[PDB]
Amino acid sequence: DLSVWGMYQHADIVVKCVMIGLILASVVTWAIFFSKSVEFFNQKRRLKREQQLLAEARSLNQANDIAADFGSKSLSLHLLNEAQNELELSEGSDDNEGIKERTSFRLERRVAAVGRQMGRGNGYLATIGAISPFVGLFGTVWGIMNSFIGIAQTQTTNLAVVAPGIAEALLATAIGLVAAIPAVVIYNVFARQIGGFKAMLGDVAAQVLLLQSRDLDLEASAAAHP
Amino acid sequence: SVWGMYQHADIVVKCVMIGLILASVVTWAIFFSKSVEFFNQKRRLKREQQLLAEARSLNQANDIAADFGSKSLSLHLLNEAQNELELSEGSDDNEGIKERTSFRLERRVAAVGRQMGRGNGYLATIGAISPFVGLFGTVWGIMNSFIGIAQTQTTNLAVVAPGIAEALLATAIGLVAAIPAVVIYNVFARQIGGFKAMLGDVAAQVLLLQSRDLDLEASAAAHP
Amino acid sequence: DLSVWGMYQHADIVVKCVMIGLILASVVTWAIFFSKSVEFFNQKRRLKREQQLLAEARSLNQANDIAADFGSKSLSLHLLNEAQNELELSEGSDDNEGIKERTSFRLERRVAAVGRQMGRGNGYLATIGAISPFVGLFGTVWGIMNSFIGIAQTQTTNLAVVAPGIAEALLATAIGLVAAIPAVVIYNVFARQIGGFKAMLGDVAAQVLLLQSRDLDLEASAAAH
Amino acid sequence: LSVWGMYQHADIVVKCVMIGLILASVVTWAIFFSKSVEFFNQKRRLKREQQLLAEARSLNQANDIAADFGSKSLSLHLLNEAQNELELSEGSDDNEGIKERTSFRLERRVAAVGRQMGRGNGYLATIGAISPFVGLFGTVWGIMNSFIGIAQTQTTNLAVVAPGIAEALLATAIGLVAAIPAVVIYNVFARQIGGFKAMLGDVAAQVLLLQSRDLDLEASAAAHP
Amino acid sequence: DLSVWGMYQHADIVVKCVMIGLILASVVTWAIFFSKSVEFFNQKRRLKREQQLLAEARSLNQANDIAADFGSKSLSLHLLNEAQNELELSEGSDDNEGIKERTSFRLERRVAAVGRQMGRGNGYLATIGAISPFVGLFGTVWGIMNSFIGIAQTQTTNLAVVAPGIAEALLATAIGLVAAIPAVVIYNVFARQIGGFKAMLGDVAAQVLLLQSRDLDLEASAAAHP
Amino acid sequence: NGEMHDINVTPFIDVMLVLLIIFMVAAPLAT
Amino acid sequence: NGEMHDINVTPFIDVMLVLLIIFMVAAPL
Ligand SMILES: CCCCCCCCCCCCCCCCCC(=O)O[C@@H](COC(=O)CCCCCCCCCCCCCCC)COP(=O)(O)OC[C@H](O)CO
Ligand SMILES: CCCCCCCCCCCCCCCCCC(=O)O[C@@H](COC(=O)CCCCCCCCCCCCCCC)COP(=O)(O)OCCN
Ligand SMILES: CCCCCCCCCCCCCCCCCC(=O)O[C@@H](COC(=O)CCCCCCCCCCCCCCC)COP(=O)(O)OCCN
Ligand SMILES: CCCCCCCCCCCCCCCCCC(=O)O[C@@H](COC(=O)CCCCCCCCCCCCCCC)COP(=O)(O)OCCN
């Protein structure tokens, strides 16, 4: 034979389907990578700028005055709106402990939802990077099984007749490893990025929570004591 | 032919290939059944959640979800909140009411998760023990081959090739039966987790509505 | 060679001892299974009956009157007695929140302890299912190595006196896998059954807790107003 | 020749693999013996202490019971932490604060004792999980040296492959001998540490219940003559 | 053939690049190990002497007068400063429970952030220890496959004309495992050490929380009940 | 539920190479 | 930060599987 560009041609039926299935796996891996990488870089840059602007907040009104201009798909604006909307709905309630508990609960749900939406896509990468070595192994086990069939039937010697069979059988697992290397590299990259992003988001949410709690306490005190 | 060597194997490779083909058939039956059920339940719950996100009180929420059927998980959750609010009548510790309600709702969400994960036991066990039953098939095949090489002392290693063919066929069947089990199991684990979090969000919505109503009503009744 | 018995006899010394060790491991796994399955089955049936009988108790006193005849080894009687013993020890207190904290704490203690005592036994199944292929395979490597060192003599001949001596190492491997498959099947069956049972127990514990909490709050509010 | 003569004429890298794995085995067995004696003694003391404190009924009575449990008594460090907090918070009239701080310290210290018990388990886990790959490195070196051998000459007999096969068998045989007991022992010790941490948590829970009950009762009696 | 080092330059392009990639991965692993190991040792030592010094503080003011000289990068001084910062930002409140809730929230955020700032290169270590055996096996399979393609194109039924190719292949595999195993043991070592140090930080933060709670409750019980 | 759900590679690699060593020492027998 | 892959998985049975085809017909020829 000559190379993979010629060996894939006359390989087999089931070995050829294994090779095509693994090529499709690799293509979907690189598509996932490109899309998620550009979106992650965009979102993380935006949120890091917004947190650096919010770090100079001393009250929830001042934080809304800062973040009045953060576009419309800014996670920071969504969290500040959860806090403000809870304060709006509970207008008429005199249980500031209740207000704080409700807002903590809403922000917990919202940060979890953003985490899951960011992570959506990594199941493909995990399962590909985990099982493509085994699909390659099945391709080579079938190739070698057919090699032994060919040796048994019309009995022959001189491995110069079986060499193309073993070449075809190994090519399957070579494509397997080629398709399961970038899946694991990309999966680890994105696990680290998602972790860092969920942590930064939790920091912004905790900032909102501290601002609201501190404001409620100081208001109740300065209104009841004097 | 691949089908002509299934009978060639003597006993304990044939009764390993039958076992693994049955395991694969059961795997795919489980997959089709559970996947249709998950799609249906997730569609219904998503419709009901985005239908309830426009409710401002538990009264309006029971008005909305008054007709969600009977297998409606959102209806189960709303009725557990209202059942607690009804059993605790004559009480005055609204924090106690909220505590018990959240307790029951969390128990209920976990119960629905566990009731959905029913069969993933088979998927896990098969995905773990199928490569080993295949490999035991192949080791037994090669052992039987080397035993047959000694009775007739056929010193040529060109005629015992079908024995190794059968051994490797048992291993390939082991992998065919073992890989879809692991893939499908991971998919179902992940899909159950996602649906469980969406259900937790509907539960959280019920909890927020109940707490808000309780505090608003108590404050209004205390300060006329 | 021979089929099975002469195969074991020809297993020289270390292959023979490893095959014996693995047969005894398989026997102990099947003993664990056949002796834990009836215990699990009886306990789960009993607890499911008790829980269904108690789901119609609207106050802790009615729950006690119902579960008064459940025997001495009834888990639901143990839980209801945790609740009642706490309500008896705190006699003279006036902190319903404190009583609820203490009772919930004791009840989670009891439920975790019952879970541990149910699971007691799965360690042996996990260990065997996780090391049995390796013991069979060490027997295999030693058998092949000893056959190799036995033919390490000149042996300028082609009569295949290696076939019997090399078709017993593989036998130790096959016995290793026969001892490793049912260990994992049974470990998974028992892990699922223990999870299910512990969830049922948690259901009964939560029912006890809610009953006690309602009665505390209702008593307090009725006495205050 | 025998297995010793097999080891004597193996490659340098294969001898270093085998030395590393035998020393890993020796450290596994030293760990097993030391940790086994310490677990037996610790769990014996603790079980006796808990079975003594099962009849406490009050924090003062528990202190007078445990006044002489030596000084290594974990069930004495916990009692003295509860008492130390109840004494550092003298003059404070908030009892929920005292209960909260005591519970915080006791969870802290139970976690500390658990982390001290699980000391060496990291090493056992590392060996038991890695050693098959050091064995596989030895095997691959053996096969590669067999092939360099059959390339040096032009023939392929048993004599030119014997060294590579000796290496491939011996290296992975010691791999298995060093990775089977690491897994067995790591599992028995993880199970025993889980059991001991549970026993320690149960004594901690006793201390918490006694303290909290006593605080509530004394406050009720002080507020209602 | 010749030797190990006399048989890594005569391999094909794919196998040579595989072996060079694995050697660079092993070098990166060892540099990471040495740097982070001296860092962890230093940090653990400084924190231990700080915790010893503080374990004899009865008031938050006394703890802050002990830690008035721990330096600038002192994690303990950061935690005491966060406690004092919440307590002086909420000046005017009367919700001691609010102050303690905000303080505990902030200190646990800070502890977790230090943990994640310590686990920095472990992504490199895990990726290397997970993909290096695969790069070794891609090398060996490409080597054996090229060898058989050559044997079939040359029509030489011997084995001495094919053994060196298999030698170099299996060499690439052994180097794959050499680059994999140390990375994995060091990743486990660093995960354990990071868990231990995070428990030590948790204990210092718990000390701060207890000092603050006692201070607040004693101040209240003295000023409200003379 | 701590049930075993993923394939293991370690018992599956050490056995399929010992299955090579048997074929590496018994194949030169027929020479 | 994430559920990373730190596993060291090596399904290269395919190699020793091809090594054995070699030695099957290598000596008897
Ligand atoms: C040349 C090679 C020799 C071949 C031999 C191969 C052996 C095959 C594999 C056998 C491994 C079985 C060992 C498994 C160890 C795990 C057991 C375990 O987890 O038990 C711990 C915890 O797990 C449990 O709670 C339940 C385990 C009980 C089951 C033990 C049965 C042992 C019988 C095993 C059969 C093997 C037969 C070997 C014959 C060679 C012990 O806790 P403890 O509280 O009971 O401590 C008591 C203390 O020692 C008192 O002194
Ligand atoms: C040896 C033969 C083995 C072949 C392996 C084929 C496996 C067949 C199983 C096919 C199951 C299809 C999964 C159902 C997908 C629908 C669920 C969904 O929408 O998303 C899932 C994600 O989709 C998957 O998980 C697909 C699994 C990957 C399948 C491809 C891997 C197989 C390896 C290459 C196969 C080519 C070999 C074929 C030649 C014999 C789960 O969500 P998530 O948690 O993972 O992430 C959030 C996404 N919203
Ligand atoms: C070629 C020879 C082969 C030798 C065979 C070796 C087999 C595997 C080697 C196993 C080594 C086990 C490493 C020890 C892990 C224990 C971790 C530990 O105890 O942490 C302490 C110290 O840990 C270390 O510094 C040990 C780190 C050494 C890493 C070794 C890296 C190279 C090992 C790979 C050799 C395998 C090579 C295979 C391929 C050639 C720090 O704790 P502390 O009490 O002092 O304070 C904080 C609480 N933890
Ligand atoms: C280049 C490729 C080949 C690499 C070969 C690597 C060979 C590695 C050999 C094995 C190393 C074994 C390390 C021995 C010390 C392990 C000590 C231990 O087990 O733990 C204690 C370690 O105590 C210490 O203080 C360790 C401090 C670090 C020691 C590092 C030693 C130097 C290792 C450098 C190897 C560099 C090799 C390559 C050089 C180019 C802590 O015990 P504990 O009870 O407090 O906690 C146990 C649970 N974690």
Coordinates of N, CA and C in Angstrom, one line a residue, chain D residues 85 88-94 97-98 101 104-105 108 112 115 121-123 125-126 130 133-134 136-137 140-141 143-144 147-148 150-154 156, chain E residues 1 3-4 7 58 100 158-160 163-164 166-167 170-171 173-174 177-178 181 184-185 188 192 196 199 202-203 206 209-210 213-214 217-218 221-222 225:
Chain D
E85 N -15.6 26.4 75.7 CA -16.4 27.5 75.1 C -17.4 28.0 76.1
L88 N -15.4 30.5 78.1 CA -14.9 31.7 77.4 C -16.1 32.6 77.1
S89 N -17.3 32.1 77.0 CA -18.5 32.9 76.8 C -19.2 33.2 78.0
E90 N -18.6 33.3 79.2 CA -19.2 33.8 80.4 C -19.4 35.3 80.4
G91 N -20.6 35.7 80.9 CA -21.1 37.0 80.7 C -21.9 37.3 79.5
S92 N -21.8 36.4 78.5 CA -22.7 36.5 77.3 C -24.1 35.9 77.7
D93 N -25.1 36.5 77.3 CA -26.5 36.1 77.6 C -27.2 35.4 76.4
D94 N -26.5 35.4 75.2 CA -27.1 34.8 74.1 C -26.6 33.3 74.0
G97 N -25.7 31.8 70.4 CA -24.3 32.0 70.1 C -23.4 30.9 70.6
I98 N -23.6 30.6 71.9 CA -22.7 29.6 72.5 C -22.9 28.2 71.8
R101 N -21.1 28.4 68.3 CA -19.6 28.3 68.4 C -19.2 27.0 68.8
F104 N -19.4 24.6 65.9 CA -18.4 24.9 64.9 C -17.1 24.3 65.3
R105 N -16.7 24.6 66.6 CA -15.4 24.0 67.0 C -15.4 22.5 67.0
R108 N -15.0 21.2 63.5 CA -13.6 21.5 63.1 C -12.7 20.4 63.6
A112 N -10.4 17.4 61.9 CA -8.9 17.4 62.1 C -8.5 16.0 62.5
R115 N -8.5 13.7 59.4 CA -7.4 14.0 58.5 C -6.1 13.4 59.1
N121 N -2.5 6.9 53.7 CA -3.5 6.5 52.7 C -3.2 7.0 51.3
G122 N -2.7 8.3 51.2 CA -2.3 8.8 49.9 C -1.2 8.0 49.3
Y123 N -0.2 7.6 50.0 CA 0.9 6.8 49.5 C 0.4 5.4 49.0
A125 N -2.6 4.7 48.0 CA -3.4 4.9 46.8 C -2.5 5.1 45.6
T126 N -1.5 5.9 45.8 CA -0.5 6.1 44.7 C 0.1 4.8 44.2
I130 N -0.7 3.1 40.5 CA 0.3 3.3 39.5 C 1.1 2.1 39.2
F133 N 1.5 0.4 35.8 CA 2.1 1.1 34.7 C 3.6 1.1 34.8
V134 N 4.2 1.0 36.0 CA 5.6 0.7 36.1 C 5.9 -0.7 35.6
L136 N 4.2 -2.3 33.3 CA 4.1 -2.2 31.9 C 5.3 -1.5 31.2
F137 N 5.9 -0.5 31.9 CA 7.1 0.0 31.4 C 8.2 -1.0 31.4
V140 N 7.5 -3.4 28.4 CA 7.8 -2.9 27.1 C 9.2 -2.7 26.9
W141 N 10.0 -2.5 27.9 CA 11.5 -2.5 27.8 C 11.9 -3.9 27.5
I143 N 10.3 -6.4 25.9 CA 10.0 -6.7 24.5 C 10.9 -5.9 23.5
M144 N 11.1 -4.7 23.8 CA 11.9 -3.9 22.9 C 13.3 -4.4 22.9
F147 N 13.5 -7.4 20.7 CA 13.5 -7.1 19.3 C 14.9 -6.5 18.9
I148 N 15.5 -5.7 19.6 CA 16.9 -5.3 19.4 C 17.8 -6.5 19.3
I150 N 16.9 -9.7 18.3 CA 16.7 -10.4 17.1 C 17.0 -9.6 15.9
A151 N 17.3 -8.3 16.0 CA 17.8 -7.5 14.9 C 19.3 -7.6 14.9
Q152 N 20.0 -7.7 16.0 CA 21.4 -7.8 16.1 C 21.9 -9.0 15.3
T153 N 21.5 -10.2 15.6 CA 21.6 -11.3 14.8 C 20.6 -11.2 13.6
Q154 N 20.7 -12.2 12.7 CA 19.7 -12.3 11.6 C 18.7 -13.3 11.8
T156 N 15.7 -15.7 14.2 CA 14.7 -15.6 15.2 C 14.4 -16.9 15.8
Chain E
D1 N 20.5 -3.1 16.4 CA 20.6 -1.7 16.4 C 21.7 -1.2 17.4
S3 N 21.5 1.5 20.5 CA 21.3 1.8 21.9 C 19.9 2.5 22.0
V4 N 19.7 3.1 23.1 CA 18.5 4.0 23.3 C 18.8 5.3 22.6
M7 N 19.3 5.7 18.8 CA 18.2 5.1 18.0 C 16.9 6.0 18.2
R58 N -7.5 36.2 72.5 CA -8.9 36.1 73.0 C -9.9 37.2 72.5
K100 N -22.3 39.1 61.5 CA -21.6 37.7 61.5 C -21.9 37.0 60.2
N158 N 11.5 -11.7 5.6 CA 12.4 -12.0 6.8 C 11.8 -11.2 8.0
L159 N 12.5 -11.3 9.1 CA 12.2 -10.5 10.3 C 13.3 -9.6 10.8
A160 N 14.5 -9.9 10.3 CA 15.7 -9.0 10.7 C 15.6 -7.7 9.9
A163 N 12.7 -5.9 12.4 CA 12.8 -5.7 13.8 C 13.2 -4.3 14.3
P164 N 14.1 -3.5 13.6 CA 14.4 -2.2 14.1 C 13.3 -1.2 14.1
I166 N 10.1 -2.0 14.8 CA 9.4 -2.3 16.0 C 10.1 -1.9 17.2
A167 N 11.5 -2.0 17.2 CA 12.2 -1.5 18.3 C 12.0 0.0 18.6
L170 N 8.3 0.5 20.0 CA 8.1 0.3 21.4 C 8.9 1.2 22.3
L171 N 10.0 1.8 21.7 CA 10.7 2.8 22.5 C 9.8 4.0 22.7
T173 N 6.7 4.1 22.9 CA 5.7 3.7 23.9 C 6.3 3.9 25.3
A174 N 7.5 3.3 25.5 CA 8.1 3.4 26.9 C 8.3 4.8 27.3
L177 N 5.1 6.3 28.6 CA 4.8 6.0 30.0 C 5.7 6.7 30.9
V178 N 7.0 6.9 30.5 CA 7.9 7.7 31.4 C 7.4 9.1 31.5
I181 N 3.7 8.7 33.9 CA 3.6 8.3 35.3 C 4.0 9.4 36.3
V184 N 1.3 12.0 36.8 CA 0.1 11.6 37.5 C 0.4 11.5 39.0
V185 N 1.5 11.0 39.4 CA 1.8 10.9 40.9 C 1.9 12.4 41.4
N188 N -1.5 13.9 41.9 CA -2.2 13.5 43.1 C -1.5 14.1 44.3
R192 N -3.5 16.4 47.1 CA -3.6 16.2 48.6 C -3.0 17.4 49.4
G196 N -4.9 19.7 52.2 CA -4.4 19.9 53.6 C -4.3 21.4 53.9
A199 N -7.5 23.1 54.4 CA -8.1 22.8 55.8 C -7.4 23.7 56.8
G202 N -8.9 27.0 56.5 CA -10.2 27.0 57.1 C -10.2 27.1 58.6
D203 N -9.1 26.5 59.2 CA -9.0 26.6 60.7 C -8.7 28.0 61.1
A206 N -11.8 30.0 60.8 CA -12.7 29.6 61.9 C -12.3 30.3 63.2
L209 N -13.6 33.8 63.0 CA -15.1 33.9 63.2 C -15.4 33.7 64.6
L210 N -14.8 32.8 65.4 CA -15.1 32.7 66.8 C -14.7 33.9 67.6
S213 N -17.4 36.5 66.9 CA -18.7 36.2 67.6 C -18.6 36.5 69.1
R214 N -17.6 36.0 69.7 CA -17.5 36.3 71.2 C -17.4 37.8 71.4
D217 N -21.0 39.3 71.0 CA -22.0 38.9 71.9 C -21.7 39.4 73.3
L218 N -20.4 39.4 73.7 CA -20.0 40.0 75.0 C -20.3 41.5 75.1
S221 N -24.1 41.8 75.5 CA -24.5 41.3 76.8 C -24.0 42.2 78.0
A222 N -22.9 43.0 77.7 CA -22.5 43.9 78.7 C -23.2 45.3 78.6
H225 N -27.4 44.6 79.2 CA -27.7 44.0 80.5 C -26.6 44.4 81.5

